Structure formats: C-alpha cells, structure tokens
Symmetry: C3
Subunit: 131 residues, 3 copies
Amino acid sequence: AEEIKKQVQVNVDDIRAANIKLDGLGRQIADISNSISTIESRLGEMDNRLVGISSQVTQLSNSVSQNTQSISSLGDRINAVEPRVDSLDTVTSNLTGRTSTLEADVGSLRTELAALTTRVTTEVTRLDGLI
Amino acid sequence: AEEIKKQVQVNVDDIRAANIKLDGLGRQIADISNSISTIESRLGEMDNRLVGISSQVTQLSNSVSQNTQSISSLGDRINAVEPRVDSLDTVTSNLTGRTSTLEADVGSLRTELAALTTRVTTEVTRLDGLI
Amino acid sequence: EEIKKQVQVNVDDIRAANIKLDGLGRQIADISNSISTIESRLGEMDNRLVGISSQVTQLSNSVSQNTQSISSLGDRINAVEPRVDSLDTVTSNLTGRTSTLEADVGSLRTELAALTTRVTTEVTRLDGLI
Ligand SMILES: [Cl-]
Ligand SMILES: [Cl-]
C-alpha cells in the first residue's frame, strides 16, 4: 500500500512532466512554421527577381539582334561602295592619260600653226620682193 | 484507498489525453514534411530557371563578341574607303581645271587657224592682183 | 490487487509516451536540419542571381558601346555615299567633254594639214607666174 501510494505520486509528477515536454514540442513546431512562412516569402521574392532578370536578358537579346541587323545593313552599304571606288580609280586614271595626251597634241598643233604663220610671212615677203 | 483508486483513474485519463496530444503533433509533423517536400521541388524548378538564364547569357555574350568584331571590321573598311574618296575628289578637281584650260586653248587654236586661213586668202589675192 | 496492476500499467504507459515524445524530438531535430539546408540553398541562389545580374549589367555596357559605334559608322557611310554619287556625275561629265575635245583636236589637225598644203600649192603657183 505504501509502495502503491509512492508510485502513484511518481506517476502524477511524470504525467505532468511529459505534458510540459509536449507543450515544448508544440513550441518547436510553431517555430518551424515561422521558418517555413519566411522561406515561402523568400521563394516569392526570388521568383520576382528571376522574372526581372529574364526580362533584362530578353530585352538585351532584342537590342543585340537589332545591332546584328544594323551591322548587316552597313555591310551591304560598304559592299556596294567599295567596287564603285575601285571603278572610279580606273576611270580617273584613264581620263588623266587622255587629258595629258590632249595637252601634248594641242601644244604641238599650236607650235606647228605658229611655224606656218611665219612661213606665210616669209613667202609673202619673198614673192613681194620678186614683183 | 478511495483517494488512491481515484488518483489512479485520473492518471489513466491523463495518459490517454497525452497520447491524443502526441497523435496531433505527429499529424502536424506530417504537414511540415509535405511543405518541406514541396519547397525542395520549388528549389529544383528555380535551379532550372537559373540554368536556362545562364545558357541565354552565355549565348548572348558570344553574339555581343561577334558584333564587336564585325563593327571593328566595318570600321577598318570605312577607314580605308574615306581617303580613297578624298584622293578621287583631288584628282577630279585637278582634271576639271585641266579640261577647262584645254577647252579655252582649243577655242583659241580654232580662232587662230581661221585667222591664218583668212590671211592666206588676203595675201594670195593681193599678190595675184600684182601679177 | 487490481490497483497495483493498473499502477504498473501506468508506469509502462508513461514510459511508452516518453519514448514516443523523444522520437518526435529527434524528428523535429531532423526537420531543423532540412530547414538549415534549404536556407543555405536560398543564400547560394541569391548569390547566383546577383552574379548573373552583374554579368548582364556588364554585357549591357558592351551592347551600348556597340550601338554607339554602329551609329558612328552609319554617320561615316552616310557622308561617303553622296560623295561617290557626285564623283560618278563629275567624271561622266568630264569623259563626255574629253571625247568632244578629242573630236575637235582631230578636226583641227586635218584642217591645219589642209592649210599647210594650200600654202605650198599657192606659193608654187605664184612662183610659176613670176
Ligand atoms: Cl498511477
Ligand atoms: Cl551588340
């Protein structure tokens, strides 16, 4: 009987102690629920950042695509200009030769015309002297 | 004895209440385990998005390097073309002056040849009249 | 007695509850480890997003430099093109004028040879009459 009463007291105190440890586990679960709520907020902010970065990459891709198209257009324009400059080098070089040839020919014709002018003066003077 | 029997019955009750509280905590742990599983899958979907973005940035970086090189090549071609066009403006300016001078010189030679033609007619007429 | 038996059953049931409580205590410790790893993964992912953003910012500066260089090359080609069109016009006009000069000079050369012959023929004729 004395043994019974002693053990029943121990059981009262052990049941109360177990119930306090169960309340402690409930507080640990509440703290885990707060960690999970915060993790979920962080996952939402990271989702927002990933949307923002993806938009920046998409926009940058479009600007690079526009630059590749502008470079192709400038390439077409320089491709068209280069052979026109090569052609003009040939045209002006051939014109230069023809201008030099004309300057030599006109100089020769002027000298020959001046020699014929003096020949006319000489011959008319001579004929006048015989008459 | 009646006091003992009553406290043993209350302990039986309290041990059953404790076991109901333990069952409730196990259900809460099962709910947390589910949330953790879903968070771990979300960590994987975000890892996938980051892989996709990183691959887009690598590709874009290659395109930008290709464009910077294409721009330097076009720059070298325009740098080469510009002084060739400046040289052609110099050649053509100098040929323009030379062509104008030839047109004035040929006009003068034509007038002078017509004057000598007239002079030959005048002097021959005069000499014939004296004979 | 029935009391003594129930008190012993209660001892054993309280120990079974403490074992189960200790098991839930270990499961909560394991969940706390899972949370710490998840937090570490979020911190690494935040860093990766910062590193990617920095690379995109640097790449965007290079793209801006290229767009600017493209506008400068555009200005240079815009200036060249009409100068090449002008040179085609000017050289075409000079070519036409040079062919006219060559025809005129050819004509003058023939006319000068005819006047040279005429001076010889007329001087011969006059000499013959004297
Ligand atoms: Cl008891
Ligand atoms: Cl670019």
